[PDB]
Design a protein that fits this description.
The structure is a homotrimer. With about 260 residues, the first copy, chain A, is of the alpha+beta class. The first copy, chain A, has a single domain (about 35-230), classed as Acid-sensing ion channels like domains (Acid-sensing ion channels like fold, Sandwich), CATH 2.60.470. Chain A has helices spanning about 5-25, 140-145, 150-160, 235-260; strands spanning about 30-40, 45-50, 55-65, 85-90, 95-105, 115-120, 130-135, 160-165, 170-180, 185-200, 210-220, 225-230. In chain A, strands 1, 3, 6, 9, 10, 11 and 12 form a seven-stranded mixed beta sheet that branches. A five-stranded antiparallel beta sheet of chain A has the order 4-5-2-7-8. Chains in contact: A-B, A-C, B-C. Chains A and B meet through helix 1, strand 8 and helix 4 of A and strand 1, strand 10 and helix 4 of B. The complex binds 2-acetamido-2-deoxy-beta-D-glucopyranose (3 copies). One 2-acetamido-2-deoxy-beta-D-glucopyranose binds near residues 85, 86, 87 and 99 of chain A. Chain A: It is a multi-pass membrane protein. Chain A: It is found in: Cell membrane. Chain A: One of its GO terms (biological process) is chloride transport.
Chain lengths: ~260, ~260, ~260
């Protein structure tokens, strides 16, 4: 006789709407990630902020794929780079004054341009000597700034610093990572990898008290990495899917009405 | 005259169903990944398992952003940390007995807390001296455990061990990575970045034969990195998507029927 | 009276057409990434290209989880590995000739197999001595090749090289990363982590002028890490989604006609 079957029809309808709402809520909480790479023809000269306390910069120069042997390992030489001294106050603690030396970074990644730095510390009471360094994207931005101390204070918190020790040569391969945030901020940051090589001290024994620091800065590759967060929750697609499901259920109900019209 | 056109209609129907099934099967095999970061106000004191064979722990202390200079680089000092000695058997080979010293790690990342350790090895025949260490999440979990040896054996396989060498000071910045998989094991693991600094030996030449090991443990940042695997294949969304496609083909047939008539 | 409301109906139709098309265009530009791991029962013996200028290979051997202590740190020993010398021209600059020594890498990861290498450099004028090395996937592929020089020239650009310094022992843990791209290059590359340990020089003072290089090669784990790029924009799904949306406005309008009737 006459049997009611559409109860299951709107039960399935409500069930589908419930799962659609749950799925949309779940997708709203777990954005996926996307990674891309961008090739550059030349880099913008970065800024390297060095923090030598009493160590004096013996030499600095711009080189290419090979560094010529040092004429004199531990004596003053020629400085052939653009440097800028700055004084500011540590944001972490406002009782310590920080003096930094800013050096232009290399640009020609295609020609494997590099910057070679050599410092000397005469004497100290510490038993683990190292020099702090920080990397920021644009040296020109540092130059044309009404408040250089404020720029340095902001970069102290916005960036992370590393160390290089004496008695070694440290080779640093540096790369750029850009990130797109939900609010739309373009966050640029530095990645870096180090390689340490023992320094063979051939200086006379009278000069062995002084400690030498050697460091090299140059780009790893011309590829800048890009990371973006993609949200896979589109309300209009969900609305269209729900509408299509509702139409399908309505036409299935009409077909069932016809079927029970013939026989049932 | 009368021309049959709906042949293409259900041909397109079968076409769409076939590609929908293929897309669903393909999506079932390639789950996407999602990455999030969680900021903490304080960490849970980790456990550092150290394996010094004959080296003796000269000193250990809890510090902050700067370490004061050593009063004496290579003489016994004061131990100011909580340590626990344990013995167990190596899961990799059940013929070797391992003795470990467990140290409770730093807790406050907001104040940049450090743990500083200094060991001394008197003499040995090896020409490459290093000390093994392992990191696990909770020291309290180790403390309150009916079988500490079983805990160590499980952590030996569940975690990865590293080394720090003599004649250096090693600075280790550690971070926490949580991972969620299909069945829900909520795995937690450690990541590190290490920096080595030469030790300027100013000790008298009579004591130069002994090797000094210095190591520092610190949290890199208060951010824990969470990774999850998201499956983008929803069977019920596909069913509703397939259901809607059939309606258009049926609805267009009536419009096509009117055009024929 | 008679009020026209379907103006909003095809306004919503045009809005829904502009949407999902903006979405398709956006999704075609941002493919998602998928990460998987594959367990192996045994690796394939890699090729290690070493570039010692004047340093002579004192010793090479295949070991397991522990290396026995050296019988003599700085004297010639026994070479117990398969090596092949090759000469070619640097692709970066065609005016320099490069001579490489190819060593067949470790094979079994379940037993923690090691390759141990020891070189000696007698004397040189440089003040920073290091040896270059490069890793490629298959040593057998290198062996059976009509042009070995061309193989090395291709591997120079297709791979990246690292260095290991003298006065240290360098331990290298290496792993394989596979990547699937659009047209199917299935690029395989090497990831590596290093650990340096000070070498305790106990040689007589007369032989201290020579530099000793020690290096160890081992697989980190039996997990090959795979990366794929998934495009989430399916035109067939988009067409079906648009088809369902159009029918909703048509049937709702018919219901609206009944409502005003
Ligand atoms: C930074 O302070 C030092 C104090 O020793 C001073 O000599 C130097 O001129 C200052 N430089 C700048 C840029 O303020
Ligand atoms: C644990 O091992 C150590 C060193 O091997 C030794 O004191 C003894 O065998 C064990 N000690 C205790 C307290 O279990
Ligand atoms: C390859 O180079 C080596 C060293 O430069 C030298 O024996 C010769 O030039 C070449 N040998 C062979 C066998 O091709």
């Amino acid at each position: 006789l006459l049997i009611f079957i559409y109860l299951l029809l709107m039960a399935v309808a409500v069930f589908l709407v419930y799962q659609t709402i749950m799925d949309f809520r779940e997708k709203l909480k777990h954005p996926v990630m996307s990674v891309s790479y961008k090739e550059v023809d030349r880099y913008d000269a970065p800024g390297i902020a060095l923090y030598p306390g009493q160590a004096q910069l013996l030499s600095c120069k711009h080189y290419y794929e090979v560094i010529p042997p040092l004429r004199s390992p531990g004596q003053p030489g020629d400085v052939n780079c653009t440097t800028q001294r700055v004084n500011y106050t540590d944001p972490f603690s406002n009782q310590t004054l920080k003096s930094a030396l800013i050096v232009r970074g290399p640009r020609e990644v295609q020609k494997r341009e590099l910057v070679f730095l050599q410092f000397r510390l005469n004497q100290s009471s510490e038993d683990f000597s190292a020099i702090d360094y920080l990397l920021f994207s644009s040296f020109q931005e540092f130059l044309q700034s009404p408040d250089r101390a404020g720029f340095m204070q902001a970069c102290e918190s916005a960036y992370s610093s590393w160390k290089f020790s004496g008695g070694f040569r440290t080779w640093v391969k540096m790369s750029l990572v850009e990130t797109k945030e939900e609010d739309g901020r373009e966050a640029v940051e530095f990645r870096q990898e180090t390689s340490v090589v023992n320094y063979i001290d051939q200086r006379p024994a009278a000069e062995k008290s002084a400690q030498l620091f050697f460091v090299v800065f140059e780009w790893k590759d011309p590829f800048i990495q890009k990371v973006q967060d993609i949200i896979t929750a589109n309300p209009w697609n969900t609305i269209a899917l729900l509408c299509g499901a509702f139409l399908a259920l309505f036409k299935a109900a009409e077909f069932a009405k016809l079927s029970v019209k013939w026989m049932i």
